[PDB]
Structure formats: C-alpha cells, structure tokens
C-alpha cells in the first residue's frame, strides 16, 4: 500500500516549456542577445519562475520574453517555425500600463494549459516585445497553410484576452515578414 499521489506530486504539464530572454544590446548580435532562462514541466515550477522574474511592463526598451516548447528555438528559422507565422497583437502606449502584463500572463496560461484543444500541437510558443513605439504580443504557429488550426487558435486567443469583437488581430507568415500582410484575421 502506497501514498496517494495527489497529496504530494507536482501537477504535470502536457509539455516542457522554455522561457527565453532577449537583451537589447546593439554591440552584440541578435543571436547572441537571445538566451535561455530556464525550463519547467509542472504548474508549480512555472509559478516558481514567473513569481521571481520582472513583469514585461518593467523591462527596458527592446527586450523580450519568449516561451517555447522544449526543443523549439524562439527564432523563425527553426524547423518548427519556418513554415508558420504568428497571431500579432499591437498595443498602444497607454496599454503598457493597463493590459501588457495581463495579456502576457493570459498568453502563458493558454500555452501551458493547452487551451487550443487538438490544435495545441500547432502551437510553438509566444513572444512579448517591449518597445517604446508600442508593445507586441504574439503566438507562433508551425504551419501557416493549416487554415483550420490557425483560425481556431486566433479566435480562442482573442476571446481569452477579452478583446472586443470590433478589434481585429492579424496572422502574418514568417516567410512574408522575412509592412506585412495578414493571411488571416479574427
């Protein structure tokens, strides 16, 4: 007779996740400013890492957090990113105080909680850009020609953030980005 696992096990996530950090440094390269923080695979280790790091709104201009599935680098030239794109949300400057941190947390919860049902295997990761002209949050998808997966992810994401129906967000392919047109909108 053995101990009941629910009294002592950490709560496991579907996936291992990696949090990355981008440091704004013009003397270094893009590749070398992008660096791993740490990995986690349970709810308890996710909060241990979230609770000691700075909120996005307190970061210096030019920095990014990136949360990607273990094995996928947060750059578009990665094998699981190069045929996909991203649902992009652009925030005005006033949103920095009121929505940035709440949207980014909600975004983290959607990834680690697998909120996109069977299209969750299409999710690669998410990036928040802290910029003086306007912050941006985005969820990256592995294939831009998978219409039904991309469409479902975009719609679920937009209502999870609480965005009003009149506010339109676009999905832009990494290959087109590399003034970008939207393949999809919700």
């Amino acid at each position: 007779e053995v101990a009941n696992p629910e009294h002592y096990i950490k709560h496991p996530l579907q996936n291992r996740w990696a949090l990355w950090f981008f440091k704004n440094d013009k003397s270094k390269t893009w590749q070398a400013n992008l660096r791993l923080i740490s990995k986690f695979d349970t709810v308890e280790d996710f909060w241990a890492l979230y609770n000691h790091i700075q909120l996005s709104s307190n970061l210096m201009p030019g920095c990014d957090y990136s949360l990607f599935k273990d094995g996928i680098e947060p750059m578009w030239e990665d094998e699981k990113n190069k045929r996909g794109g991203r649902w992009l949300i652009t925030l005005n400057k006033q949103q920095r105080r009121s929505d940035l941190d709440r949207f980014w947390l909600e975004t983290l919860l959607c990834l680690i909680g697998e909120s996109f049902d069977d299209y969750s295997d299409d999710v690669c990761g998410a990036v928040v850009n802290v910029r003086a002209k306007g912050d941006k949050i985005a969820i990256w998808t592995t294939e831009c020609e998978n219409r039904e997966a991309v469409t479902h992810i975009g719609r679920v994401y937009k209502e999870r953030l609480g965005l009003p129906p009149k506010i339109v967000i676009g999905y832009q392919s990494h290959a087109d980005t590399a003034t970008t047109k939207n393949r999809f909108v919700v």
């Binding site: 709560h11 709810v43 996710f46 909060w47 979230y50 909600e106 909680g113 697998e114």
Partner: peptide, 14 residues
C-alpha cells in the same frame, strides 16, 4: 491530454 483551466492554474501562484 493534460489540460488546465485558467482559474485552476492561478490557484497555485501563491
């Protein structure tokens, strides 16, 4: 397979 509600996750933050 392992799916979690937002309110369930937010309960382990503290």
């Amino acid at each position: 397979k392992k799916r979690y509600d937002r309110e369930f996750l937010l309960g382990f933050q503290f």
